[PDB]
Symmetry: C3
Subunit: 311 residues, 3 copies
């Protein structure tokens, strides 16, 4: 719902209320995961040349019992667009990495996940000062590039997107907080088809489950998806992350073990643009073992069912 438009100032005010339930043995899965989002995009125009924006999107849980809060700013930032010289926007905002990682982040419930938000760049973060440049100066059509800075520690980022005309797209991003991480992705967006795959390499994953970081991490994800016309986007997808020599902060070592790996059958049923329902079944592969045990890492297969209502 875009709620204000007068004198070159547009303000949209989105929200969703997803009521959903997990089913799995792992007792910190099975249960209600209902939550809602309240966000707001914004726009102010001055001039022909430049347009000023500003955005904010919050996630508040509705699974938590009364007297209790669960919530975080998903993003908050404010920027400036200059016509043909792209944009600058400072504040809590998706890492440049996510530019290419996002292509695989499209499953009905689970996905992305190999990185976290505040996983030292790969999804969101704080203090982020991005510059985006779209259509390379009005010069090379279809080629967009972004160069980022993260706050604290320090980090630099770069991402290069290219849809080789058509629906084929190639994806490349490098991110190096101070601990570099790489990323390549491919996506095919055509005749109600969606094929996307991406993977990446890193120095340290740090902030991971509850057990420190490796010295090398190897994450890969891929999904195929069709868009039926009565509304129904059955998605099957696979992703996995592998480790290296990993510390319990102090000592511990845990070594060479899988971090996450699963196949995913999923169906998202779009009623209309504003209401969806979805069913999602995570086919988990990981074996309940010391690494997973101590670090709380989910070893059980789960299946989630949810009724999303947006705006």
């Amino acid at each position: 719902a875009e709620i204000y438009n007068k004198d070159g100032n547009k303000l949209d005010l989105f929200g969703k209320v997803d009521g959903l339930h997990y089913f799995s043995d792992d007792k910190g899965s099975d249960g209600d995961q209902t939550y809602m989002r309240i966000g707001f995009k914004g726009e102010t125009q001055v001039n022909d040349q430049l347009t000023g924006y500003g955005q904010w999107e919050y996630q508040i849980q509705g699974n938590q019992t009364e007297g209790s809060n669960d919530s975080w700013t998903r993003v908050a930032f404010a920027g400036l667009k200059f016509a043909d010289a792209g944009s600058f926007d400072y504040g809590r905002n998706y890492g440049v990495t996510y530019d290419v990682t996002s292509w695989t982040d499209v499953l009905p419930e689970f996905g992305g996940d190999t990185y976290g938000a505040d996983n030292f760049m790969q999804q969101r973060g704080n203090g982020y000062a991005t510059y985006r440049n779209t259509d390379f100066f009005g010069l090379v059509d279809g080629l967009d590039f972004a160069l980022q800075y993260q706050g604290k520690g320090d980090g630099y980022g770069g991402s290069l997107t290219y849809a080789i005309g058509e629906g084929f797209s190639v994806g490349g991003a490098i991110t190096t907080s101070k601990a570099t991480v790489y990323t390549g992705g491919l996506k095919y967006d055509a005749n109600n088809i969606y094929l996307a795959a991406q993977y990446s390499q890193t120095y340290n994953a740090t902030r991971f489950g509850t057990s420190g970081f490796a010295n090398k991490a190897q994450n890969f994800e891929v999904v195929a998806q069709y868009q039926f016309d009565f509304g129904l986007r059955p998605s099957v997808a696979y992703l996995q992350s592998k480790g290296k020599d990993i510390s319990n902060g102090y000592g511990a070592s845990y070594g060479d073990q899988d971090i996450v790996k699963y196949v995913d059958v999923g169906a998202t049923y779009y009623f209309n643009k504003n209401m969806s329902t979805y069913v999602d079944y995570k086919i988990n592969l990981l074996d309940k073992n010391d690494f997973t045990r101590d670090a709380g890492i989910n070893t059980d297969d789960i299946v989630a069912l949810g009724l999303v209502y947006q705006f």
Copy 2:
């Protein structure tokens, strides 16, 4: 304030800011209780037959000093209406019990209260999957029935409402998380008159003050109210809850004591639909004693005065 309506999508965005002060000796009463609510109802139509909704209402305190948060999702859920086959809506939502208990929940400040929110069904809760059916299939006019499911533990619910034409209404609901609870209510809604009374019986009340649960609990409430035409709804009301063999979780026992009992004189003065003022005087009866002492249960008479502004 309904803020968007285009193409069969309605979104209303309500809020209230109630500034109010308590007066009583009990030092965790006397004082400011100012708070605000921000909610949003929603609607998307597809088709003749079915309409998709979604709702959310938050209560944030304004009594708390700076650097501090007090807040909870009052409700969050998303559902589906099918024309003549009623509705389904999953998420944080009023227990089916409250269908009939609500009839007595109408006093200017205090009331309801014999149950809490997260009092194992009787008001709100989490994980709730309700089905409502109104006008019994378009067949029996004036007869609505709801059947519920609570999340975790597990629970089942059923509520049957009937306004015997006129303004007379009979109310019946049974709820049994796993610990059954019963409920009958009566309400008379006519010529600016409001007479409502309800009571109920239970297995265990659990989550109560700070001291475990009984083996049998007996709660009853009744209110009469007139609606004067310059705007003024003086309400007098009485309610009370009695206990059984009650544990300090471990041991303790406390036995057969009153849980809450009071008479209530109250006046709600409606200026216009959007601004009210109100005065409310709780005539408490409970005696400050071991049960009440240790369990913090309010034994003092309080009187509250507040200026509500909605939207």
Copy 3:
């Protein structure tokens, strides 16, 4: 963005997203300070004579990492205007003192500060029941006066504003929670000029850094500011607070030391009404010493740069 107007009910819904970064050695300065505000003013008219309002403005940080909340109700209250007999509004609301203190609270980032919010009156507070009277009964034009009450402990307030025609304004307020505090201010608002200065005297400042209160506190602030016409309001400003015999709650004493003192060079660049950018450089003077050390009081010079986007 005023979002509803129908039938004498106006509801405005403001917000800002300020993305800004501090630069200083003090490690609890240098960094991201991004935050957003979401507020809402309201209005309902009934009648010729009286109009009912209600307000709410929240500040949520966007500097905090994910799974984490930072936030407070800036204000929440609801009131009543009677035409020529001014207004009453109860709830979390700026102390009457701030009526005159505010004149110096106008710098691009830092300022005000000699008092805090919940600094026993001088800025915001809880339980506040204000009465404002503007234009002294329609009688003495340009003379407004406010008389306040704070919640808990108890307090009384009074503030007298006068713009001696022109842009010259004289300011006077006294506030005495139970611990009196005084205030005089002067402001000159004319030909794109802004000159304002205020200072005040107190009994106890209490809630200050981390170290109790003095027996006498002496705070003074002054700013000059010009409004260039391409948009640019370079502001230079100076303020300082001095102490008396001050306790670590228990014992400690710390004595006669400066509390805060700095000169401020600042520029606020208004693009259009809805987007600003700003640069601000706090020239701090305080010496890192026992008082400051133990009480965490910022002894370092900082400079902040931010892109605000309102609505």
